[PDB]
Amino acid sequence: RGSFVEMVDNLRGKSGQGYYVEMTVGSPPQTLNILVDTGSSNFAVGAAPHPFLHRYYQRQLSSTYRDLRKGVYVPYTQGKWEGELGTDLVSIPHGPNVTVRANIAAITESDKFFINGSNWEGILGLAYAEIARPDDSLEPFFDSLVKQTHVPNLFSLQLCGSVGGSMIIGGIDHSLYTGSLWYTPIRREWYYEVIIVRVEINGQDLKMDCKEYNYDKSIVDSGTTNLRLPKKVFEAAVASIKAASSTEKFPDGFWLGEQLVCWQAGTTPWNIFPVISLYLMGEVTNQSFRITILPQQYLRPVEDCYKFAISQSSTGTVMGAVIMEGFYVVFDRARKRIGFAVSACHVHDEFRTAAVEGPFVTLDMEDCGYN
C-alpha cells in the first residue's frame, strides 16, 4: 500500500497517440503494447496482420486460449472493429505479480481504429460491464483481476504530457502527486461518470445551469485526447477564452480545431491564456472542490504549432488526456469515487501550475446531473 516502485514509469506514448502499457497474453506469453482506456470496457487486441501493427495476438500459439465461439462487431463515430471472443491468461509485466483468465476480443477486421505509425496493438478498456460489448455479461479485464486475485479494487493513472507515466494497479503511489487528493463520487458504474458543478474561465463563472455541464454525462477518459464540452458549454467557454486572450488574434477555424496556430520557437505567450477551473461534486453534502488546468494542457504541440484541444461534444463532457495530464487520478472503484491530486510530473511554468483545492460550498449539486 502507498509504494509500488515496480509500476512507476510503466506507460509510454507518442504525443496524440495515447498511453499504453506492456501486457502479455497466452502461454507462452506474447508481449503486446496496449492502450490504457478508462472510457471503454473491452480488452480488444489486434489478432491478424493488419499492416499498421508491430505485433498481434496469435491464438494458435497459446495452449491456454479458450474460444467462446461468439463474434463481436463494434462501431464508433469513425471506425469500427469486429472480432472473435474467447479467454486466455493475461499478465502485466510492470504491474502486479499475478496472472488472470480474462476475456479477450481478438480483432479480425478494423477500420480507422489502429493508428499508422503508433506503437500499440490493442486497447485495455478499464470501465464497467454496463458498456462492454456485446453486452454486460462480458466481464471486463479489471473485474476479472479483482475477482481472481487479491489485488485491491482500484487503480490510478499519472499521464505525463515522447509521453510516459504510471498506471498503479491496486494502489496509489505517493511520489506521483503533491498536496492532497480530493474525491468526486462516481455517479453510476458504466463509464467513470462524475458531476461538474461549476466552470470558471480565469475565475469568471460561465454561469450556466449546471445541468448544462453534464448534458448528457461527464466522464473521465484516458482514451480521448481533448477536453470535450457539450456544445452549449463549449460555445460559452471559447467565447470567454477568446475574450481573455484577444490581446492577440488567431484565425477563427483555430477555435474549432480546423487549423493549427504557430509561433516561432519558444515565443508562445502562455500568460495571455487563462486557466480553466472545473468544480466537481465533493464527497460531502453541499461541498465541492476544484481542479484548475493550464493553457499548457489545452494547447497541444503538433510536431511551435499547437492545436486547440477543447472541442464541442454531443456525448457530454469528456475529461481526456488534456485534463488528466495535470493530475494524478485515482479510480477508487471500491469506494465508487475518483480522486484528483496535482501530478508530480505535469507541464507548467514559472507563473502558474495546475491546482486541486477545496472545500467550497456549492448548493443544489444534485440538480447538475442529467437524467
Ligand SMILES: C[C@]1(c2cc(NC(=O)c3ccc(C#N)cn3)ccc2F)N=C(N)O[C@@H](C(F)(F)F)[C@@H]1F
Ligand atoms: C475504444 C475507444 C477508442 C479510443 C481510442 N483512443 C486513441 O486512439 C487515443 C489517442 C490519443 C490519446 C491521448 N492522449 C488517447 N487515446 C482509439 C480508438 C477507440 F475506439 N475509447 C474511447 N475512450 O473513446 C472512443 C472513441 F475513440 F471512439 F471516441 C472509443 F470507444
Ligand code: NA
Ligand atoms: Na479479490
Ligand code: NA
Ligand atoms: Na505525495
